[PDB]
Amino acid sequence: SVLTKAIVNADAEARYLSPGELDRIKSFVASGERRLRIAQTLTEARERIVKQAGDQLFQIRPDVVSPGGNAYGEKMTALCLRDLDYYLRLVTYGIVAGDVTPIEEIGIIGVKEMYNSLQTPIPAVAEGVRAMKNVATSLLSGDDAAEAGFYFDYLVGAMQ
Amino acid sequence: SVLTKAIVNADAEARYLSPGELDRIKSFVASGERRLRIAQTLTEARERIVKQAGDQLFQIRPDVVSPGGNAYGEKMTALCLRDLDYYLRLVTYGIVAGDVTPIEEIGIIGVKEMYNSLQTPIPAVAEGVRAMKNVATSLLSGDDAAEAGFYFDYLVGAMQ
Amino acid sequence: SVLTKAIVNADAEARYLSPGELDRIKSFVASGERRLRIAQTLTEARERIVKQAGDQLFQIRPDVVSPGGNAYGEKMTALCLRDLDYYLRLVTYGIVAGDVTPIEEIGIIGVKEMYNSLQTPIPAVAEGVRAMKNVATSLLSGDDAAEAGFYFDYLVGAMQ
Amino acid sequence: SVLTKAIVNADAEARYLSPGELDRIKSFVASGERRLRIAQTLTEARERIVKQAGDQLFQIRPDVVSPGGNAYGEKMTALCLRDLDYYLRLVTYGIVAGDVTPIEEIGIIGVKEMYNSLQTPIPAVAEGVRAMKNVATSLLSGDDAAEAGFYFDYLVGAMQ
Amino acid sequence: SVVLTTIMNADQQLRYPSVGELEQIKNFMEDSALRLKVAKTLSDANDRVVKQASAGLFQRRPDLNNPGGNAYGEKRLGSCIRDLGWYYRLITYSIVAGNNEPVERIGLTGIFEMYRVLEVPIPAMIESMRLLKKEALELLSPAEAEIAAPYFDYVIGAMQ
Amino acid sequence: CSISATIVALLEMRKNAARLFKDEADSKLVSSYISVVIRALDADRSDAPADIVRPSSEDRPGLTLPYIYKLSADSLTTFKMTAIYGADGRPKVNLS
Amino acid sequence: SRYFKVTACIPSLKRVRTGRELQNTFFTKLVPYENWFTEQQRIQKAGGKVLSVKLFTGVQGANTGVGA
Amino acid sequence: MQDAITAVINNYDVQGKYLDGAALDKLKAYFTTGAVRVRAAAVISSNATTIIKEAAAKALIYSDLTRPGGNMYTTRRYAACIRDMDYFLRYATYAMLAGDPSILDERVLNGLKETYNSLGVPIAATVGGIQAMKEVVGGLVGPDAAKEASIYFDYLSSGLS
Amino acid sequence: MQDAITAVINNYDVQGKYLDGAALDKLKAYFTTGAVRVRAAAVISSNATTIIKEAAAKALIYSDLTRPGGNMYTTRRYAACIRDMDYFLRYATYAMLAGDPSILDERVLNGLKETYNSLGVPIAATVGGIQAMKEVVGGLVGPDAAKEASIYFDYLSSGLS
Amino acid sequence: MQDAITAVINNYDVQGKYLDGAALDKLKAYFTTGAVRVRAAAVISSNATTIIKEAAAKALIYSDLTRPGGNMYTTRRYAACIRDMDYFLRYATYAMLAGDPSILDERVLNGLKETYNSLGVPIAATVGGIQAMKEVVGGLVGPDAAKEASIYFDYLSSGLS
Amino acid sequence: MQDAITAVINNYDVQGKYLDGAALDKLKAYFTTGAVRVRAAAVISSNATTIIKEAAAKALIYSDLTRPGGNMYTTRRYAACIRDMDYFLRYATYAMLAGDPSILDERVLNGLKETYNSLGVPIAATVGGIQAMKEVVGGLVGPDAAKEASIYFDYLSSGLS
Ligand SMILES: *[C@H](C)[C@H]1/C(=C/c2[nH]c(/C=C3N=C(/C=C4\NC(=O)C(CC)=C4C)C(C)=C\3CCC(=O)O)c(CCC(=O)O)c2C)NC(=O)[C@@H]1C
Ligand SMILES: *[C@H](C)[C@H]1/C(=C/c2[nH]c(/C=C3N=C(/C=C4\NC(=O)C(CC)=C4C)C(C)=C\3CCC(=O)O)c(CCC(=O)O)c2C)NC(=O)[C@@H]1C
Numbered sequence A, B, C, D: 001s002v003l004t005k006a007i008v009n010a011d012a013e014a015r016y017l018s019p020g021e022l023d024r025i026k027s028f029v030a031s032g033e034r035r036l037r038i039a040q041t042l043t044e045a046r047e048r049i050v051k052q053a054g055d056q057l058f059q060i061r062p063d064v065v066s067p068g069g070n071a072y073g074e075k076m077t078a079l080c081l082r083d084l085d086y087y088l089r090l091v092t093y094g095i096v097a098g099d100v101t102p103i104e105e106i107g108i109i110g111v112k113e114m115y116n117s118l119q120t121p122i123p124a125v126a127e128g129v130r131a132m133k134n135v136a137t138s139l140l141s142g143d144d145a146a147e148a149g150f151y152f153d154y155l156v157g158a159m160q
Numbered sequence E: 001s002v003v004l005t006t007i008m009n010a011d012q013q014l015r016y017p018s019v020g021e022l023e024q025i026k027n028f029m030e031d032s033a034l035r036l037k038v039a040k041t042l043s044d045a046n047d048r049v050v051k052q053a054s055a056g057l058f059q060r061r062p063d064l065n066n067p068g069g070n071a072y073g074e075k076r077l078g079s080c081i082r083d084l085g086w087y088y089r090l091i092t093y094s095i096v097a098g099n100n101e102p103v104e105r106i107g108l109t110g111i112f113e114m115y116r117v118l119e120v121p122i123p124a125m126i127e128s129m130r131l132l133k134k135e136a137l138e139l140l141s142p143a144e145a146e147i148a149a150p151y152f153d154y155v156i157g158a159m160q
Numbered sequence F: 001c002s003i004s005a006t007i008v009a010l011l012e013m014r015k016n017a018a019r020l021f022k023d024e025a026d027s028k029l030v031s032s033y034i035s036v037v038i039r040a041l042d043a044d045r046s047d048a049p050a051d052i053v054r055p056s057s058e059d060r061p062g063l064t065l066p067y068i069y070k071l072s073a074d075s076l077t078t079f080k081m082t083a084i085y086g087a088d089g090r091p092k093v094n095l096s
Numbered sequence G: 001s002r003y004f005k006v007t008a009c010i011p012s013l014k015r016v017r018t019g020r021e022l023q024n025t026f027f028t029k030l031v032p033y034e035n036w037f038t039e040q041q042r043i044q045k046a047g048g049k050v051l052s053v054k055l056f057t058g059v060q061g062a063n064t065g066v067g068a
Numbered sequence H, I, J, K: 001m002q003d004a005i006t007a008v009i010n011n012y013d014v015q016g017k018y019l020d021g022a023a024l025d026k027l028k029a030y031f032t033t034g035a036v037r038v039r040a041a042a043v044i045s046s047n048a049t050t051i052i053k054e055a056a057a058k059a060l061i062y063s064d065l066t067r068p069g070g071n072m073y074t075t076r077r078y079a080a081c082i083r084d085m086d087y088f089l090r091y092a093t094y095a096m097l098a099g100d101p102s103i104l105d106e107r108v109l110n111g112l113k114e115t116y117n118s119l120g121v122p123i124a125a126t127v128g129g130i131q132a133m134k135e136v137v138g139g140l141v142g143p144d145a146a147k148e149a150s151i152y153f154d155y156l157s158s159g160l161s
């Protein structure tokens, strides 16, 4: 979070919190209300967002749901939708925390090794996250849509 | 090669060549002629091996030759078979050298970054090398085929 | 041995064994019965090798068996012959092993300080080892004589 | 010398000269009179000490004058006596300097490679140094003789 | 500034700016429109606030302008007032800048090492900057005082 | 504290310790030792030469040490070798 | 296998080190090719400048002989 | 280390749930108590040194720790304090800025008893000094912000002893 | 290194001048446009690998550089050139964010020229790759940050050439 | 490094010659002045802080060097200049005690002028500071070792210039 | 390093065609020269110390260099010279077994002249010692390996001079 990233940074120099750091912590606590509201709005519509994102992903990359596809079958498709739900949850965690620190440790470090072991298309997963971003920004006002989509673009860039 | 490896190992310890190290060099120089025969055989059968490897690879993995595949069209498929020709040449170089130093310095170090930048399926390239090994095994004696298959399997493991 | 060297280097670089290392292992296992026969011949002729080695060493350096000599006295010469038998056994160990790790860990590391402690001529010990080399190669065919000579010369170079 | 070692150690400590090192400076400057007195007392009888040391070395070690030894020949004996004169120069250098810094740099470091390449008995040279110790001590007062004997015994340890 | 502090961390960790870092970089600028007049107001008092703080400080500590004092003499008093002006200029520079960068990099890293050969009271500078912060805030409103107080706290929090 | 009051008292103690001794070397020794206290007291700023700060990373805290604490230690013998003057070179060189 | 022969100076501007800060502030030293980038990045990060770099050991062709 | 924001996320991620009403209420409470914490942090800063001096005079000095034999008897033992302290401040100012024990247990109060047991260092004295600092900071900070600073200081003292 | 802000601070501290109307005008001119800098930097960070891919495809590969006898020949040299590609892109993004090429001079151009000379790197090829980077980045970011992004790529190209 | 005794010993070792009458006179010439060197070194080491304090008042401070645009401007540069002055004083003491500028050439002068060229430090200002320290040392040590102390400061100044 | 096989591999790699009949002939020739190469290397390794002894006795000892005022004077310098001699012998054996003087250039011949001039080591005497090792190996090894041994032995002398 912003608090963790600020306090530990002013602890590696053996000084108190910087007068420059008795700021953006301030903007974080000021915008925490909006962050909580945006996270709640995303959480209420988790099933619809996941379903529509999976639909768009399966149209745009139909090879994955073909017989030679990693997600071929009803339960392999259920697992793909479960992964999309996991990443939506991580995005909400990032939104509430105000930093991508929690999502980074939870679902990004080693994701390349995991998906290479499972033989899953990482570009396909990234496109699924993009579809989730589109469906999420369709349900939000412009400022909140930009704020959520900025984390969504972080996920897309990191899975790369 | 074997000579450069033994010499580097001795030079690092700052001592002369150990008896086992000399025995290694003597065995390699005694067995060089068989490696030369392997190299000339693979050289004169270079194009048939590449064509059959391409056929096997395209049968195994239709996704590479597809609308969204990395190799769609004519020049893409030309470049893929060209890369197979480069790896065949590297295999011949390794066979004549008796080790994998030239192969390592030419075509594996950084190949992961290069193929990630080009978005080419590394498992697809490994499948192509495996098909090349299967083709090459049908044009050599059993001991000679095993000798070539050692370096083919080295390339397969290195592209992993 | 060669297996220990190859496995140790592969573990140090954190990788599987290279094809060149596998080839050296194959050659080493191929030469096993020949190495065993050479070692059997030497161990059968262990006492004669030691006796004429002592005679050659005493002819070359009578000063060592002189009043100011390290091995002056019958029991001092018995200790010199016992060290000679020790080094012959180490040579047989190295010949069967195919390299010089056992010989190194048993009889060269610290040998300089030990013989300085005992006030014994290291060049005299090396000359005795050379006499052993001559006597041992006098009982072996040319290739096996050269193979034993490599380890004898390694001992002479190490005691330097 | 004393000043060199004191300044080097104080600089490595990263501080001014300690009162301890100042003590060794202030006492070395005072004792330089006695050190110099020992200097020309040994220098006046440099040749006689070397000759008598060589004589008693020859009587104590007949093995160096042997068919395998390096002393058979008046030229070889002269070469040995010249080495003795070199070392008496070295010991008087150390006596005047107060520290053994010049002696180590001039005639002990690499002397093992010296006499291994030249095939010369290091224990015999040590015995000659002890003989020379006795000859020099025979012409000096007891405290002064012990002061020179410290450096002579250090040389006796150095060729070991 | 804030941009320098963020980019230094990003380049130290070898990565682009973060998803929580840009949120702080953007919030650093949106209040710059307000803060420009805040630092501006202290700008056109620079030869008056220090002039008054002399009258707040050397009566509080009268040994600074007494015969055993460091600021005895008109020119010596001028040096202390010029130092106060330097600190006022640097704190205004940091107010315009963001993080502690302008003051810490120029006139904060090495205060004790300067005064070690200067004989100037750090506990006196503590009250000096206390009075500087005391007198520089009443020119502002409470809204600007909240955006000025931490920027003043860093001097007396660092020199301590 | 009256620092000037204490320094003059230290001076009086040093001189009076001098009066006891006959200045062979022993009266000089006491004067030199008590002068150390006054000299390492006065300046006000060479005293307390900051705290040696050990900088840390984002995973562990950064530390500080009082200067006097390590000044009463074994003083940290170090080894440093000077030889960039020249690979190919010009300066005094020699072996050192 | 090849070592670059370089010379450079690196000033420390945050701590003012106080004992023999001269040998660590201007140096020439052979640095390996595999470690040259990480060695040279440190000078730029600290703030010093590299005065010169030389191939010294290896040939410009590379290909075989690069590994070590 | 952890704050409230990170703690809620961590103990809602282990069970794999989205943030519900209870998690939102906890985050709401921290966000509502997010300004007095920042003000009291700045108040603790700057006036840190006088806080340490007052705490030392109130608890440490004028006791066994100063006469011969004490663990603060000479200078450099007096200097290891103020140091030792400035921690227990610094930290717990971090705690009452990213409020959670966490940091106090991971960086300051962990093996400290072992270090003090191996170095002398009277633990009862160094905890009485903590409570003196608690009192002085409660005095300086204010009526309502005196609490939660009292909370983190009590956590530090209790954990140490 | 410096940005526009700290560049103004240092440029006034060198003669000891307080911030005046002209200096505040420069700071205002920097502050009014940096939001587009933030958006462009975010877009570049999200599309870093794609930009390198199109720049290499347009300027370097399908040529003699990737063939035998070329500098980019072999996977090791290919990975080296793409890592240099990424480094140039990242430092260009840092320079555009800071509004000053001081970081580019300090950590990019220092030693790169004679380093490439001693290594055999084709400086013309690197310049062409940098301009392909600038073209792709200008296409991606849009009119708002196109010239600000492109000026530092031109700075890198001019420093190399 | 080398002292007088070490230098003469090496000069005789290179010829392989025994210590002659001239070497004896050189060694005695060093020995007769040993005590005054120790006294002057103790005098320098006792009050070196006051010496550097006085020397800073005559050569560099109260000038454009300490103002903005000056080399010694800012806290870091000022402390670095005083550390360099302490380096010069301590190494001059070492050279005086050893009776040979060899340590000064080995561990002070080598690389120093090109380092100052790269850093922009005023060599003339450093020379003036070194000389002012030289007068302060010559005044403090007295007639007994004033010239002997001053010759090594002169060597330092001549090597720098 | 680059042996004969690696050199041919590089020669075909820079041009980008397969191995040819000429390459087959060259590799076959080097394979034919293998056994005598190994035997000569074994003999040289066996009699390494003897070669240095005869070379020293022929060109190095009993001369002006082995007396006071010489670079060979002092046991440390003589040991350094003999260790350099062993370096020459070992790297000559390595190059002889490899077939190419790349090791001789990069690991040995690279530098070795600026360092010698800086140290003051005579170079004509070193070349004479290298030739002395040349006649010693000429007698120790058989005439089959004499010419190829001599060419690598002359390579070091030509590079040094
Ligand atoms: C074919 C079986 C697979 C495949 C390959 C593919 N490769 C490229 C492009 C390139 N490949 C290389 C290769 C090398 N350069 C070297 O130095 C070496 C070592 C000897 C090799 C192997 C290079 C340099 C390129 C870039 C173009 C060029 O050569 O100039 C492509 C084209 C990718 C694109 O985006 O255009 C493809 C498709 N594709 C498959 O599906 C197979 C698994
Ligand atoms: C005498 C007690 C012993 C002995 C000695 C011996 N020495 C040589 C030959 C040489 N000795 C030296 C010595 C030195 N060089 C140095 O720099 C120093 C340090 C000051 C020393 C001591 C050298 C250089 C030689 C080589 C000839 C030369 O000086 O030019 C020999 C001759 C060996 C030969 O093969 O001819 C001998 C015999 N021999 C004994 O038996 C004693 C134990």
Ligand SMILES: *[C@H](C)[C@H]1/C(=C/c2[nH]c(/C=C3N=C(/C=C4\NC(=O)C(CC)=C4C)C(C)=C\3CCC(=O)O)c(CCC(=O)O)c2C)NC(=O)[C@@H]1C
Residues within 6 Å of the ligand: G010, G011, G012, G013, G016, G017, G020, G021, G022, G023, G025, J060, J065, J070, J071, J072, J073, J076, J077, J078, J080, J081, J082, J084, J085, J087, J088, J107, J108, J115, J119, J121, J122, J125, J126, J129
């Ligand atoms: C002081 C009178 C003048 C002055 C000096 C100044 N020096 C530096 C920086 C350095 N000084 C040194 C010195 C030494 N290194 C050594 O090894 C020795 C002898 C053992 C010495 C004397 C070096 C190497 C540096 C650079 C590294 C470092 O900073 O420690 C500075 C700082 C320059 C900067 O900001 O980068 C200054 C200011 N300045 C003046 O105005 C005086 C004329």
Ligand SMILES: *[C@H](C)[C@H]1/C(=C/c2[nH]c(/C=C3N=C(/C=C4\NC(=O)C(CC)=C4C)C(C)=C\3CCC(=O)O)c(CCC(=O)O)c2C)NC(=O)[C@@H]1C
Residues within 6 Å of the ligand: F061, F065, F069, H060, H065, H070, H071, H072, H073, H076, H077, H078, H080, H081, H082, H084, H085, H087, H107, H108, H109, H112, H115, H119, H121, H122, H123, H125, H126, H129
């Ligand atoms: C002060 C009220 C009490 C006291 C203390 C005392 N402490 C030390 C020495 C150390 N204290 C620490 C402490 C810490 N290190 C950490 O990392 C943390 C948390 C982040 C703490 C609290 C350590 C490690 C040491 C030892 C090393 C060092 O000194 O830095 C001393 C010195 C003991 C000695 O002389 O050896 C003292 C005296 N003394 C009192 O009288 C009080 C009870």
Ligand SMILES: *[C@H](C)[C@H]1/C(=C/c2[nH]c(/C=C3N=C(/C=C4\NC(=O)C(CC)=C4C)C(C)=C\3CCC(=O)O)c(CCC(=O)O)c2C)NC(=O)[C@@H]1C
Residues within 6 Å of the ligand: G033, G036, G037, G040, G041, G062, I065, I071, I072, I073, I077, I078, I080, I081, I082, I084, I085, I087, I088, I107, I108, I109, I112, I115, I119, I121, I122, I123, I125, I126, I129
């Ligand atoms: C790529 C577009 C071109 C190219 C490049 C190339 N570079 C190297 C090697 C190095 N490149 C660097 C670069 C930097 N150091 C820095 O500090 C920075 C900025 C922060 C840069 C950009 C360095 C240090 C090296 C040497 C060490 C290393 O390789 O990492 C190579 C390899 C050369 C070789 O094989 O020896 C190459 C090929 N090649 C092309 O074809 C393009 C025109």
Ligand SMILES: *[C@H](C)[C@H]1/C(=C/c2[nH]c(/C=C3N=C(/C=C4\NC(=O)C(CC)=C4C)C(C)=C\3CCC(=O)O)c(CCC(=O)O)c2C)NC(=O)[C@@H]1C
Residues within 6 Å of the ligand: E064, E070, E071, E076, E077, E079, E080, E081, E083, E084, E086, E106, E107, E118, E120, E121, E124, E125, E128, J061, J062, J063, J066, J067, J072, J073, J074, J075, J078
């Ligand atoms: C003022 C409240 C206290 C005080 C101060 C005092 N200062 C000086 C002299 C100098 N101060 C500086 C300061 C700086 N140099 C820098 O680079 C910076 C960073 C921007 C600073 C702040 C300098 C350089 C000097 C020396 C003179 C010069 O300008 O070069 C004095 C005079 C000391 C003397 O011996 O004359 C004084 C008195 N004194 C107090 O009592 C106050 C508590």
Ligand SMILES: *[C@H](C)[C@H]1/C(=C/c2[nH]c(/C=C3N=C(/C=C4\NC(=O)C(CC)=C4C)C(C)=C\3CCC(=O)O)c(CCC(=O)O)c2C)NC(=O)[C@@H]1C
Residues within 6 Å of the ligand: F094, F095, K065, K070, K071, K072, K073, K076, K077, K078, K080, K081, K082, K084, K085, K087, K107, K108, K112, K115, K119, K121, K122, K125, K126, K129
């Ligand atoms: C010998 C025939 C002649 C001779 C030589 C001599 N050399 C040195 C010192 C050094 N020699 C080296 C050499 C190398 N370093 C390497 O890495 C390599 C290749 C792998 C070589 C060849 C170096 C670097 C040194 C300096 C460090 C050291 O001493 O080991 C000396 C000593 C000089 C001194 O006292 O400083 C000598 C005497 N001298 C002769 O007279 C011979 C003709």
Ligand SMILES: CCC1=C(C)/C(=C/C2=NC(=C\c3[nH]c(/C=C4\NC(=O)[C@H](C)[C@H]4CC)c(C)c3CCC(=O)O)/C(CCC(=O)O)=C2C)NC1=O
Residues within 6 Å of the ligand: F001, F002, F006, H061, H062, H066, H073, H074, H075, H078
């Ligand atoms: C052997 C070296 C050494 C000394 C000298 C030393 C002194 C010393 N004096 C102290 C306090 C104190 N010291 C004094 C007073 C004075 N101090 C003086 O040197 C004057 C004689 C006098 C003023 C005229 C006072 C009043 C205090 C209480 C703290 C305070 O001033 O608030 C303390 C703090 C602990 C305590 O209260 O006892 C120390 C460390 N400790 C050491 O290890």
